[PDB]
């Protein structure tokens, strides 16, 4: 690499250069910088509105939010300090942003802080066994924030209930609204209260003066389910600035390549984003953001 004359000796593998023209290599211009152009970050699913929603269903009554055909950006909610605690199972919070999910079910409910520690794959206790159980393969995360200034009031808030008693333990992803009276002993119940007949559902006492462990916390459990169906909800795509007429490494939508971008007089069909040549190598593209 010292001199172009020395490139002749190294290519010919001889210390003597005879008179003539010799091609010792082929130069190629390396890309200066990486260009990232992604589609608009709008048309999301409103996770911030559901997390920040006024009232929630009971832990046994929890509402199933079907999340499909949108983009999920979890970096904004995590860096906004809008939650009390953050916990995940099996997947780092940064990995979720690069992955696409087939179907996502947002699990919303309000329980006391002492009952939040029981949310984890294959655990036990009151909320895990009798209310909502997490499967061992659950890939989602646990996010909670302190609602004591909202969901609690003077005199107690009876809106948020829970299932105290059940004859067995629930399976993961099993919602049971049955109000049937739990029979403790051999005394018949049949939906009638009495000796060894007790109403299983109970209402959480909620007031703003409750202790930190007993304060009501809004918990949104994100269920990430990958099925055989194609993935719908994907992580956030953050577009960058565009550079033209230079050698760059560009990644456009799901297409990558290296070359020089120049706007020409060609016109693609409105339904055709990418062009190709005779060899099916891309000779032109359309920007995912601007047209």
């Amino acid at each position: 690499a010292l001199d172009p004359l020395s490139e002749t000796k190294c290519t010919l593998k001889s210390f003597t250069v005879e008179k003539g023209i010799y091609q010792t290599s082929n130069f190629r211009v390396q890309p200066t910088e990486s260009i990232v152009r992604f589609p608009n970050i709008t048309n999301l699913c409103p996770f911030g509105e559901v997390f920040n929603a006024t009232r929630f269903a009971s832990v046994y009554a929890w509402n199933r939010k079907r999340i499909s055909n949108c983009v999920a950006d979890y970096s904004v909610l995590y860096n906004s300090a809008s939650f009390s605690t953050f916990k995940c199972y099996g997947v780092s919070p940064t990995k979720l942003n690069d992955l696409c999910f087939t179907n996502v079910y947002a699990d919303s409910f309000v329980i006391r802080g002492d009952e939040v520690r029981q949310i984890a794959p294959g655990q036990t206790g009151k909320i895990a066994d009798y209310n909502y159980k997490l499967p061992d393969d659950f890939t989602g995360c646990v996010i909670a924030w302190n609602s004591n200034n909202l969901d609690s009031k003077v005199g107690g808030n009876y809106n948020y209930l829970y299932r105290l008693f059940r004859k067995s333990n629930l399976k993961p992803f099993e919602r049971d609204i049955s109000t049937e009276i739990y029979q403790a002993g051999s005394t018949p119940c049949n939906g009638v209260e009495g000796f060894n007949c007790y109403f299983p559902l109970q209402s959480y006492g909620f007031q703003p003066t409750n202790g930190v462990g007993y304060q009501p916390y809004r918990v949104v459990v994100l269920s990430f389910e990958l099925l055989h169906a194609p993935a719908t909800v994907c992580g956030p795509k953050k577009s960058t600035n565009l550079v033209k007429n230079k050698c760059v490494n560009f990644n456009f939508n799901g297409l990558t390549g290296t070359g020089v971008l120049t706007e020409s007089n060609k016109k693609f069909l409105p339904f055709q984003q990418f062009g190709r040549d005779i060899a099916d190598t891309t000779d032109a593209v359309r920007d995912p953001q601007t047209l």
Partner: protein, 262 residues
Amino acid sequence: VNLTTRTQLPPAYTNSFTRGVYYPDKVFRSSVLHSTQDLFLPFFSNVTWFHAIHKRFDNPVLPFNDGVYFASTEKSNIIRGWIFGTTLDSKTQSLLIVNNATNVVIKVCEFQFCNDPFLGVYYHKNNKSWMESEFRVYSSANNCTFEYVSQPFLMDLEGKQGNFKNLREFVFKNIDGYFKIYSKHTPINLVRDLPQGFSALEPLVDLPIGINITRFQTLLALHRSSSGWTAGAAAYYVGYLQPRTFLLKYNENGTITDAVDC
């Protein structure tokens, strides 16, 4: 309730010449000759001739299999949509495509099987109306595993006479859960039978539902002045898609000039 009289006739066959041509993907190619293999409708194939008149009203249920070609000739927009699914019932997840003249309804829910799923229009007389009244497509929707709603629009339901001024040719298929919608709408002038001309379909949207669809239905619109409903004069086409290779000719712009079935 299915119409009392109607008619029972065998599946008479017709031959579609240039139908079945579409862009296999969003790749743009111009002034070149491209050849690729996919599920296509071969040229000069023998399709089944479907129609609706004031006493036949033929709307059979056909299997979707790998892929099925759709074509229709419209005046009053008699086609209300298509019902997709495996069993076409709440036993499985069924796909619904219907135009209510307000928003295009694409939903996957639990549907109650509709023997005669149509939309009737009553009281024409003076003040000719032609507005929707009752929805007989599905009784209820339950586990809505998928839902889609488009932007508002205005559809003209008024009946027309004379030649057919509208041609709707569609191509649907399923590949690894991806449901492709190939839509082309061009004006034509035709008395009966089928229009003769070349058409290149473009992809509309994609529905990553990921379900198997073994059967499909074709929605229709009925009107009278459910055994007493009548229908106008219209016909639509259905054909089976095969894994064939085409040679697609391209112009400068990018519009397909001609296609050659290998």
